A paper describes a structure:
The G5 motif is generally comprised of six amino acids with a relatively poor sequence conservation, although the motif invariably forms a loop with electrostatic or hydrophobic interactions with the guanine nucleotide base. We have used the EcNFeoB ([name] [name]) protein as a model system because of its clearly resolved conformational change in the G5 loop as revealed by crystal structure analyses. We systematically mutated the residues in the loop to alanine and characterized their biochemical properties in order to determine their individual roles in nucleotide affinity, GTP hydrolysis and GDP release.
Given their drastic biochemical deviations, we also validated the integrity of the [name] and T151A mutants by determining their crystal structures, which illustrated that the mutations did not have any adverse effects on the overall fold of the protein or on the G5 loop. Under experimental conditions, the [name] mutant demonstrated the fastest GTP hydrolysis rate (kcat=0.67 min−1), a rate approximately 1.5 times faster than that of wild-type EcNFeoB. Furthermore, the ITC experimental results showed that the [name] mutant protein had the greatest GDP affinity (Kd=2.0 μM), approximately five times that of wild-type EcNFeoB, which is also in agreement with a decelerated GDP release rate. The StNFeoB protein has, as most other GTPases, an alanine residue at this position. It is thus likely that this is also the case for the wild-type EcNFeoB protein, while the [name] mutation generates a more stable nucleotide-binding environment.
Author numbering: 2 to 34, 39 to 260
The structure:
């Protein structure tokens, strides 16, 4: 059974190194129409690993997006990957989980690969693996460097992979969910309900680039925002703050 896996993480998360270790000399360097692609095997699977450009987020709310960011986003939303391996820097967890949260809100099958365990230890940081997994609703695999043990556990997890656990991640105010869902109902229904509801939130948060994916929902954004502004100060801020609360709450328990 062949699997297509996207490798995604922040810049300087050790992603290039992990890609190289996983694929060895079974790799091929193309471009996105630089696009690195490689092969490896697990017990059950022949995996095609696709290296996505380093990025801190699938989008940018307050400022201009980058090319790398748009490439990652488009690939992720295309649904070409059967699952993703989200490489996370254990020494800068809070910053790294911003991207992770987006992947999980999108409902994309995910395996977190906790990297840079050494540097975390030398920064006096210990991550509670099962605490994080429980809260994210996906596997969390410590990438132990010694004798490539982390790689072997990562391959094990790929063979074990099922859907993410359907867990509440962010706790949004009810008017936000309502408005996002009603926007979602009008978006191109070729997109899954979960992603259309996320796009909805992104629109409400001021994400300009999400409007490209939302089609006819953009015609209803103004009316949704006016309503929300009559029951809370600034809907975009309530979205960002809830997301900050979620990630901060996780980090306090987990780190």
């Amino acid at each position: 059974k062949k699997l297509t896996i996207g490798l995604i993480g922040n810049p300087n998360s050790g992603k290039t190194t992990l890609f190289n270790q996983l694929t060895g000399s079974r790799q091929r360097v193309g471009n996105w129409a630089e696009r690195k692609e490689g092969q490896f095997s697990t017990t059950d699977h022949q995996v095609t690993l696709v290296d996505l450009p380093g990025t801190y987020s699938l989008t940018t709310i307050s400022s201009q997006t980058s090319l790398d960011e748009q490439i990652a986003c488009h690939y992720i939303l295309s649904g070409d990957a059967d699952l993703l391996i989200n490489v996370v820097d254990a020494s800068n967890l809070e910053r790294n989980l911003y991207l992770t949260l987006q992947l999980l809100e999108l409902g994309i099958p995910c395996i977190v690969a906790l990297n840079m365990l050494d540097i975390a230890e030398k920064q006096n940081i210990r991550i509670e693996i099962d605490a994080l997994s429980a809260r994210l609703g996906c596997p969390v695999i410590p990438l132990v460097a010694t004798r490539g043990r982390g790689i072997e556990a990562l391959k094990l997890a790929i063979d074990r992979y099922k859907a993410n656990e359907n867990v509440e991640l962010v706790h949004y105010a009810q008017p936000l969910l309502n408005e996002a869902d009603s926007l979602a109902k009008v978006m191109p229904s070729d997109i899954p309900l979960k992603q259309r509801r996320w796009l909805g939130l992104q629109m409400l948060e001021g994400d300009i680039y999400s409007r490209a994916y939302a089609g006819e929902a953009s015609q209803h954004l103004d009316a949704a925002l006016a309503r929300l502004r009559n029951e809370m100060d600034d809907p975009a801020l309530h979205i960002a703050d809830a997301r900050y609360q979620c990630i901060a709450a996780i980090c306090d328990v987990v780190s």
